[PDB]
Design an enzyme around this catalytic site. Structure first.
Site, short mmCIF file in Angstrom:
data_model
loop_
_atom_site.label_atom_id
_atom_site.label_comp_id
_atom_site.label_asym_id
_atom_site.label_seq_id
_atom_site.Cartn_x
_atom_site.Cartn_y
_atom_site.Cartn_z
N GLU A 54 22.45 70.23 8.25
CA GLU A 54 21.01 70.36 8.49
C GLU A 54 20.48 71.76 8.15
OE1 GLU A 54 19.92 71.47 12.65
OE2 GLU A 54 21.84 70.49 13.11
N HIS A 55 21.33 72.63 7.62
CA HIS A 55 20.90 73.99 7.34
C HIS A 55 20.11 74.18 6.05
CE1 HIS A 55 24.05 73.81 10.33
NE2 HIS A 55 23.28 74.70 10.94
#
Length: 282
Positions: free
Chosen positions: A121-122
């Site tokens: 999710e970065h």
């Protein structure tokens, strides 16, 4: 009767609840907060501080991990995706293969852990073009989570290499899991390539109700083609306010069939809440 995966965040919160205190009926524990480079070089982050706040020392951490493992509980290390994954030098290593070897060496060879869970999710480069997100009715999400990144070939290369040591096609029963969301740009391509490699696929459906997790299931199974048995939903124990819903989701069997189970973020954040969700899924 799904699995109950417990996140144990190592930042020292609720210190009397030690890692070794994870109760029975908890299949796995994922060390979260603590970073793989700290396992790699234990001299940079002093024990009992920062992401080692939950332990008195690295020996304490090591001892507690074995306490859980000898009880048959799998202990996994959380690994975050990073923008370097979109580069030719993931994690600073020479290639995706070198990166893969490195994680295997640190997590498996050195620390004798049972696998890894990828928190995908970065931030990084977004896809181009950005596809039109299917929408709420189709996925349980309104649109893209703009803080995520594209699963470019380089990015996929990293997961591919990890797949040689972790997951369903790797030797020595090592876990390969992912914690993400359908709203993450990389989701679709990760699933097209590796859905079968993951033992479990966790959706960070924090605060959801059964209706919403079912919308997610519809998409995950029908469009992403993910086996229902790999799907794990997120119980936000840290929030301490969605227990009734989490318990419903825990006991719930999707229309697509038995799900993988539930993961609890974080078990040590609210043990009573966590125990309730564990009980519900078991």
């Amino acid at each position: 009767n799904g699995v109950c995966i417990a996140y144990y965040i190592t930042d020292g919160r609720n210190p009397t609840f030690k890692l070794k205190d994870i109760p029975d009926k908890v299949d796995m524990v994922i060390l979260f907060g603590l970073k793989y480079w700290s396992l790699q070089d234990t001299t940079k982050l002093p024990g009992g501080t920062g992401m080692m706040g939950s332990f008195k020392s690295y020996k304490d951490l090591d001892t507690q991990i074995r306490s859980l493992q000898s009880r048959g509980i799998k202990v996994l290390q959380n690994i975050d995706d990073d923008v370097s994954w979109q580069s030719s030098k993931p994690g600073g290593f020479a290639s995706a293969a070198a990166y893969g070897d490195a994680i295997k060496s640190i997590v498996i060879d050195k620390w004798k852990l049972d696998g890894i869970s990828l928190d995908i999710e970065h931030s990084g480069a977004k896809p181009n073009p950005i596809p039109t997100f299917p929408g709420y009715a189709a996925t349980g999400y309104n649109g893209w989570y703009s803080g995520s990144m594209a699963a470019t070939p380089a990015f996929l290369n990293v997961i591919s290499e990890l797949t040689k040591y972790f997951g369903t096609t790797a030797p020595n029963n090592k876990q390969l899991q992912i914690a993400s969301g359908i709203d993450v740009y990389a989701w679709n391509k990760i699933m097209e390539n590796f859905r079968n490699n993951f033992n479990y696929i966790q959706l960070q459906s924090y605060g959801a109700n059964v209706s919403r997790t079912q919308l997610m299931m519809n998409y995950a199974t029908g469009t992403n083609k993910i086996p229902a048995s790999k799907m794990v939903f997120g119980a936000y124990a840290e929030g301490g306010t969605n227990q009734a819903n989490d318990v419903e989701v825990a006991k719930w069997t999707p229309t697509q069939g038995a799900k993988g189970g539930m993961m609890i973020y974080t078990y040590n954040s609210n043990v009573s809440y966590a125990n309730a969700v564990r009980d519900a899924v078991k």
